[PDB]
């Protein structure tokens, strides 16, 4: 048979395609089909259940909210206007899944089992440092165009959902992308700890759009550069050149992006609007303080001077560097910033005068909403604390996303280690056992 | 003589070896497994713990269980035909007769099984270290499901057979016996945790220290079911660990005996600790700590902290966990921190 | 000199070193010496730490009233949260020891080094011509330290919520965890105990089967161990006799005869199970907790019929309601 047990074992079947470019193409074309299929098929599933007059986060949605962010079918405050863009994006993908799926199935069971001969342009050689650097170069451009495909939707075709909208959350057209490298790349030099949050600290659409402009170019630039080159010297005396080794490198890459994504959806307020997803972890703990400082203040309590059990400040206290923040266990989230809460902040943090008479109703109910929709829930979807009662069936989209992606991100890091460990033994050549005859260890002096 | 003929038949090499032992093992082992599976889906724990405990009532694989008998029963064996049930079956069920049934039966079933190992070992002519090892699990079952409640007021405080019904057994022990602070429980875990390490570590050391005896990548087929050479470089393994950890085996006979020892010793220790919890002779407190905490209100250790967690567990659980005590704890008497 | 640096690289990487200081080692050896040295001093002499940011210092060192079992190195303040607190961030050490500075210096260096320790478990295997993957087995216990020392804190918003470095301090981490996440009722933890229980189980199985089927080469009054010489050609036990016995205990096809498949299983089981347990803590770090079956089964009128799931909730409430006495000022525990 073209490929059977005298290749690899059954459960390692797909490794039998390591050297059949053609068929190995069907896989990638058939697979890429499953992703479009899902994206498409799921969107329609979401929409089929979607209830306009009800929070998205209260409906187990995770795609419609992705579209909403790009400014589609929504308006003032994340209000859903037209469900058409959703239905569209959904069906379109679903269709393209059939097109791709066709090609996949075709290239894997009819077309050429190898490519090198049925066209030397597409056929390839793993150790062919140039073909590799080049195909990589092609893809580095396709991805680059994509990065601009966003910059376009935002600057020309409609905008994106800006929750920080001056008049209050709303679809806004970005016509002033931050292009200043000093700022853009500044983010990469930002600490990943409390406060300075690195990439996840992005907090306005200009930088988002601006930064994507830079990536699109920088990306396509490298796409051409690889098309027009070969790895230098070190680049060659450093890496392993093989089918597995290349995989591994891309495995460790996704893993890392998987962890970064987990933190983005968990912490970021901007590119993940609390209006479509739920309120952030810190955002919800903040809202409780808001809610009760607001309540009790109406009962005649002077929030500014209230002393709590420990003598720290029931409602307001100070952070380690002097700024006025909310008190209680919520002292850990004093780095939370959000449309609803900002108008209360002064140059020194929460201003006792604004808190004292500028709190607006929409804020009181925002704080209440977010307080009662914190990202706490159970596997069987029972919103709240582990000791809560059944009734409110809910688990924040931010919790779902974050966990799923930490698991995937993780296992992929194992995947990395595994495929990289195999590649290094494969190269030097011992990934199948120690040479009974020449057993390396046996030629080394005894350390004893 | 019929005896040797009876023997002959039994010790006959079938698909599922019977043996003399089987005459005890299979009857029991099946009844135990059966009774559980029965109660799990049909019998309730209402008349016993005021709890729904079977599929028939709405419980799922996690919440279902064969709950212990009432506390009124005491240590009664609760025989189907005894003073309690009085031959009646349904009543037996409602009085938790199914617990002592599963308990006592399974108990003999563990005796039979170890005997089996012993019997089969003898026939096949191998050493009985598989039987010695299994003493560990017996001890656990014996001390926990029998000795323990035998020291308490009744079977009611023995672990009920079920998934969740076992988690409360855990939480209870923390809350009431402060079991995690017990030297013996610690040894216990050091062994189980440490045993699950030898397991993993030895396995990997072997799979990645193998000689090449085939031309394939899937090296599984490359194995000689018929001895001969060592299938992995014991010599290479030694050097590896000797350079990464500093210490490394070098006597497969010892490396393997060690693997029997570690987890069997661990479980034995965890048993003794419980045999002591039967009399409530727990490892609850450190007197020097309590004395300083009394006189000085600013002294705080992660220990004192824990004890408070226990107080809460006891106060908030005791009511629905010990129904026979008709506990009534007014809201004002319930220990609680601020706000929560 | 063939070239200093050329030489250096030959030593570092030398496979003739008593202890293989590798490339990963160059990062490991220092970070691990700092973590260890700071810990030992802390655990012995560090002063009380305001772990909960409420000015209520918890002393956890020997010289300040603790014993081995109670003593621990306390987590950085909650006032600090996830902020980086290197010594050079404090007006003084006195201030640094009070806000639990030592904790970070330790967890960060340890986690750093323990990773390189993995990177090393690969390198040496390479320099020795043996298959990799051992380091992948060690990815499980490491992925746990990570989950318990970093993921959980990142997820929860503070390092003060990371597992303390001490015996009792750990039980605290557990008891509270259970209350806030009901972990015992989570699939991942269960898979965890299956792997650990199972491991110990199998560890005993293998251990005994093998040890019990050893070929006789020793006296009646001579350690049965001597019957093995380091650097043997053939095997030291009858894996065919082993399988013969075990196949009869249960039944033939339910028994291993392939030492390689046996040992893969032996490694696969615990590592896979612990991987899930680590993913459990890393998952409940974002509040996706265990199953909540509170008041599920209710009767014909609407009355609530308790299950063991409920008796578990009471025990959890006790923990909830009593942990961190003075740290809460509001109704819901969202932190």
């Amino acid at each position: 048979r073209d490929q059977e047990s005298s290749g690899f074992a059954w459960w390692a079947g797909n490794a039998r395609l390591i050297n059949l470019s053609g068929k190995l193409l069907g896989a990638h074309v058939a697979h890429a089909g499953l992703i479009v299929f899902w994206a498409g098929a799921m969107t329609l599933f979401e929409l089929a259940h979607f209830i306009p007059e009800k929070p998205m986060y209260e409906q187990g949605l995770i795609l419609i909210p992705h579209i909403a962010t790009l400014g589609w079918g929504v308006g003032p405050g994340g209000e859903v206007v037209d469900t058409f863009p959703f239905f569209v994006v959904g069906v379109v993908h679903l269709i393209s899944s059939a097109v791709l799926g066709f090609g996949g199935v075709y290239h894997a069971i009819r077309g050429p089992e190898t490519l090198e001969e049925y066209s030397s342009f597409f056929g390839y050689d793993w150790k062919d440092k140039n073909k590799m650097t080049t195909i990589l170069g092609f893809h580095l451009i396709v991805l680059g165009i994509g990065a601009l495909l966003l910059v376009a939707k935002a600057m020309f075709f409609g905008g994106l959902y800006d929750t920080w909208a001056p008049g209050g959350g709303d679809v806004r057209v970005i016509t002033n992308p931050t292009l200043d490298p000093r700022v853009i790349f500044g983010y990469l030099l930002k600490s990943p700890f409390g406060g300075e949050g690195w990439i996840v600290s992005v907090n306005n659409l200009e930088d988002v759009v601006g930064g994507h402009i830079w990536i699109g170019l920088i990306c396509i630039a490298g796409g051409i550069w690889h098309i027009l080159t070969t790895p230098f010297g070190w680049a060659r005396r450093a890496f392993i050149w093989s089918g597995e080794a290349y995989l591994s490198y891309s495995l460790g890459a996704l893993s890392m992006m998987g962890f970064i994504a987990t933190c983005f959806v968990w912490f970021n307020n901007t590119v993940y609007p609390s209006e479509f997803y739920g309120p952030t972890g810190p955002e919800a703990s903040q809202a409780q303080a808001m809610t009760f400082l607001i309540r009790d203040q109406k009962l005649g309590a002077n929030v500014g001077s209230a002393q709590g059990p420990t003598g720290l400040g029931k409602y307001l206290m100070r952070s380690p560097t002097g700024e006025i923040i909310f008190g209680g266990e919520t002292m850990r989230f004093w780095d939370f910033r959000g449309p609803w809460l900002e108008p209360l902040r002064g140059p020194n943090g929460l201003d006792l005068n604004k808190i004292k008479n500028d709190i607006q109703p929409w804020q009181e109910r925002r704080a209440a909403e977010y307080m009662t929709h914190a990202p706490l829930g159970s596997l069987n979807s029972v919103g709240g604390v582990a000791t809560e009662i059944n009734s409110v069936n809910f688990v924040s989209p931010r919790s779902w996303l974050a966990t799923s992606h930490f698991v995937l991100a993780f296992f992929f890091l194992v995947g990395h280690l595994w495929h990289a460990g195999r590649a290094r033994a494969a190269a030097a050549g011992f990934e199948k056992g120690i040479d009974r005859e020449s057993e390396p260890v046996l030629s080394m002096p005894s350390l004893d | 003589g019929w005896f040797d003929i009876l023997d002959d038949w039994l010790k006959r090499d079938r698909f599922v070896f019977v043996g003399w032992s089987g005459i005890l093992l299979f009857p029991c082992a099946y009844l135990a497994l059966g009774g559980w599976l029965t109660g799990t889906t049909f019998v309730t724990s209402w008349y016993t713990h005021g709890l729904a405990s079977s599929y028939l009532e709405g419980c799922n694989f996690l919440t279902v269980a064969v709950s212990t008998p009432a506390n009124s029963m005491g240590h009664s064996l609760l025989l189907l035909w005894g003073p309690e049930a009085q031959g009646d079956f349904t009543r037996w069920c409602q009085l938790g007769g199914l617990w002592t049934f599963i308990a006592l039966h399974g108990a003999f079933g563990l005796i039979g099984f170890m005997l089996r190992q012993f019997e089969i070992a003898r026939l096949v002519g191998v050493r009985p270290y598989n039987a010695i090892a299994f003493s560990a699990p017996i001890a656990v079952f014996v001390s926990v499901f029998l000795i323990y409640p035998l020291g308490q007021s009744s079977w009611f405080f023995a672990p009920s057979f079920g998934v969740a019904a076992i988690f409360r057994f855990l939480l209870f022990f923390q809350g009431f016996h402060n079991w995690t602070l017990n030297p013996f429980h610690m040894m216990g875990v050091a062994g189980v945790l440490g045993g699950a390490l030898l397991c993993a570590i030895h396995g990997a050391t072997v799979e990645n220290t193998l000689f090449q005896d085939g031309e394939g990548a899937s090296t599984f087929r490359a194995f000689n079911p018929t001895q001969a050479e060592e299938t992995y470089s014991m010599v290479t393994a030694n050097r590896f660990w000797s350079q990464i950890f500093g210490i490394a085996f070098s006597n497969k006979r010892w490396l393997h005996f060690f693997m029997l020892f570690v987890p069997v010793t661990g479980l034995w220790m965890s048993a003794i600790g419980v045999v002591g919890l039967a009399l409530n002779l727990r490892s609850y407190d450190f007197i020097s700590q309590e004395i300083r905490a009394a006189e000085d209100p600013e002294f705080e250790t992660f220990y004192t902290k824990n004890l408070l967690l226990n107080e809460g567990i006891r106060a908030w659980m005791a009511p629905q966990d010990q129904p026979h005590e008709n506990f009534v704890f007014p809201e004002e008497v319930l220990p609680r921190g601020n706000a929560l | 000199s063939a070239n200093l640096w050329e030489r250096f690289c030959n030593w570092v990487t030398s496979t003739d070193n008593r202890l293989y200081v590798g490339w990963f080692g160059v990062i490991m050896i220092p970070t691990l010496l700092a973590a260890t040295i700071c810990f030992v001093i802390a655990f012995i002499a560090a002063p009380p730490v305001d772990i909960d940011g409420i000015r209520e210092p918890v002393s956890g060192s020997l010289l300040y009233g603790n014993n081995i079992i109670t003593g621990a190195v306390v987590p950085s303040s909650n006032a600090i949260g996830l902020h980086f607190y290197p010594i050079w961030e404090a007006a003084s050490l006195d201030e640094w020891l009070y806000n639990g500075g030592p904790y970070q210096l330790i967890i960060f260096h340890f986690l750093l080094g323990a990773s390189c320790y993995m990177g090393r478990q690969w390198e040496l295997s390479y320099r020795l011509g043996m298959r990799p993957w051992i380091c992948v087995a060690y990815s499980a216990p490491l992925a746990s330290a990570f989950a318990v020392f970093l993921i959980y804190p990142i997820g929860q918003g503070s390092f003060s919520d990371g597992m303390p470095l001490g015996i009792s301090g750990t039980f605290n981490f557990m008891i509270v965890f259970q209350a806030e996440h009901n972990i015992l009722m989570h699939p991942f933890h269960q898979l965890g105990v299956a792997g650990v229980f199972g491991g110990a189980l199998f560890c005993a199985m293998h251990g005994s089967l093998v040890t019990s089927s050893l070929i006789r080469e020793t006296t009646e009054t001579e350690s049965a161990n001597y019957g093995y010489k380091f650097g043997q050609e053939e095997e030291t036990y009858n894996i065919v006799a082993a399988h013969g016995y075990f196949g009869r205990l249960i039944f033939q096809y339910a028994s291993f005869n392939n030492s390689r498949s046996l040992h893969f299983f032996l490694a696969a089981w615990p590592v896979v199970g612990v991987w899930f347990t680590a993913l459990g803590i890393s998952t409940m770090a974002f509040n996706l907790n265990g199953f909540n079956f509170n008041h599920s089964v209710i009767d014909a009128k609407g009355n609530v019929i308790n299950t063991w799931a409920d008796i578990i909730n009471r025990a959890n409430l006790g923990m909830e309601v009593m942990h961190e006495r003075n740290a809460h000022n509001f109704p819901l525990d969202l932190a």
Partner: peptide, 30 residues
Amino acid sequence: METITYVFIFACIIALFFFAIFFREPPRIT
């Protein structure tokens, strides 16, 4: 008095460690 006892045993285990790693019986082949 207690502190001293705890540290002593610890110090003794580390000493053991040393001797075990650097003063084991060299592991001889065949």
